[PDB]
């Protein structure tokens, strides 16, 4: 199985630099080049550069002066580094691999690293229960959730019961509050008759602040 | 750089219809175009290579055609799992460039929202802030009105809305409205009401609680 696994998301101060590691498996770096693509609100999908099997690099013209790509063949690691970042460099960064060693049709992508460029500070969220009750029950179905409040930057991962509960889950897009901190809720509907037997836990992981919270949500 | 122009920007279709995405190039690129799918919270998925060549693991309903400057990605029978954005890529000229993308939305029957309301947790109240959350679950189409009332005072400007992307399984949307008060203001009042309007409801739905 071909895979590409990138390091986690995080905040980078303006003018400072960006560093992402792409670890590959299911193929050797000595046989394929590894490309870097990013996706911004400004310019959508932009191709940034590539490090080839033998170490050579190409960089898209607007980035040649602030972009460097290196690798460790033995460790199956590719390193992306970009200098002098500004705010419109806030993007999802991807590593990718083409179908053949020389081509550009990207059949394999990393999961993407969301880099935020901003002068602010990293803040972990508080997690509050959205408790099931009569006011959230309808025809045997109860809704419940977690309020993931006041963190920065995006993103946060939310799961339920350590991945075993996925059906009927809705994790809403984060909104930016006037405080400059994000907030979101994640809800799920369950049979109301399971509330006395099953435990419901939202697993919250805000990787940029290394904050991991498991919030047990109970009928009040 | 080649400029790739995808048209239109949004496509809305019903399940089982055929659908076509267009990618126009600012100069001839032969057949050097690849197509990609991006689902909600996903990475791009490669669909077609070199205008029309198929990819292992991609459903047969996807196909592409075209040459020169004018290209087409086709889905012969849209499913709700096809809800995504679609991008084209040219690589006849360095550097490889991407189109700006086309969004594929799905139609379906009107579905009224289920409405639930959540008071603030005693946990949050300790911190000095009160969030009241109103949830509108699994409805179509996306348009809805949420109106907050506190002891019959209409609230304005102290709530925020979030809407999920379209559900890839049943084509509905869900919406949260969160009303945020200070603990003091919240304790100064009794009746918290979320009133909901939507095409699928014949009269507005109010869900509400008394603090306590």
């Amino acid at each position: 199985q071909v895979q590409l696994k990138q390091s986690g998301p995080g905040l980078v101060q303006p003018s400072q630099s960006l560093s992402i590691t792409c670890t590959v498996s299911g193929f050797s770096l000595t046989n394929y080049g590894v490309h870097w693509v990013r996706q911004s609100p400004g310019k959508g999908l932009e191709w940034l550069g590539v490090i080839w099997s033998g170490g050579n690099t190409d960089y898209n013209t607007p980035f040649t002066s602030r972009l460097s790509i290196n690798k460790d063949n033995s460790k199956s690691q590719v390193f992306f580094k970009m200098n002098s970042l500004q705010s419109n460099d806030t993007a999802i960064y991807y590593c990718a691999r083409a179908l053949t060693y020389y081509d550009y049709e990207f059949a394999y992508w990393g999961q993407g690293t969301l880099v935020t460029v901003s002068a602010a500070s990293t803040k972990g969220p508080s997690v509050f229960p959205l408790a099931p009750s009569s006011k959230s029950t309808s025809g045997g179905t109860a809704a419940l959730g977690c309020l993931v409040k006041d963190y920065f930057p995006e993103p946060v991962t939310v799961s339920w019961n350590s991945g075993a509960l996925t059906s009927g889950v809705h994790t809403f897009p984060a909104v930016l509050q006037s405080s400059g901190l994000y907030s979101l809720s994640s809800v799920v509907t369950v049979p109301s008759s399971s509330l006395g037997t099953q435990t419901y836990i939202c697993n919250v992981n805000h990787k940029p602040s290394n904050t991991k919270v498991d919030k047990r949500v109970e009928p009040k | 750089d080649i400029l790739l122009t995808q048209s239109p920007v949004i496509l809305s279709v019903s399940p089982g219809e055929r659908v076509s995405f267009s990618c126009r190039a600012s100069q001839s690129i032969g057949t050097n175009i690849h197509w990609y799918q991006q689902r909600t919270n996903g990475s791009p998925r490669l669909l077609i290579k070199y205008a029309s060549e198929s990819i292992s693991g991609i459903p047969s309903r996807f196909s592409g055609s075209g040459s020169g400057t004018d290209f087409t990605l086709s889905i012969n029978s849209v499913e709700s799992e096809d809800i995504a954005d679609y991008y084209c890529q040219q690589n006849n000229n360095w550097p490889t460039t991407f189109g700006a993308g086309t969004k594929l939305e799905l139609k379906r029957t009107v579905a009224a929202p289920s409405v639930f309301i959540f008071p603030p947790s005693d946990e949050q109240l300790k911190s000095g802030t009160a969030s009241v959350v109103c949830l509108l679950n699994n409805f179509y189409p996306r348009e809805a009105k949420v109106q907050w009332k506190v002891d019959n005072a209409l609230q304005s400007g102290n709530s925020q809305e979030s809407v999920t992307e379209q559900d890839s399984k049943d084509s509905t949307y869900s919406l949260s409205s969160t009303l945020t008060l200070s603990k003091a203001d919240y304790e100064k009042h009794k009746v918290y009401a979320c009133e909901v309007t939507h095409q699928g409801l014949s009269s507005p739905v109010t869900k509400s609680f008394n603090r306590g």
Binding site: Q39, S40, P41, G44, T90, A91, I92, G112, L114, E154, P155, P173, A174 | V9, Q38, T40, N41, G42, D85, G101, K103, E165
Partner: peptide
């Protein structure tokens, strides 16, 4: 425009 929270066009 592309949205970083959802990775979708908005």
């Amino acid at each position: 425009q592309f949205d970083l929270s959802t990775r979708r066009l908005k």
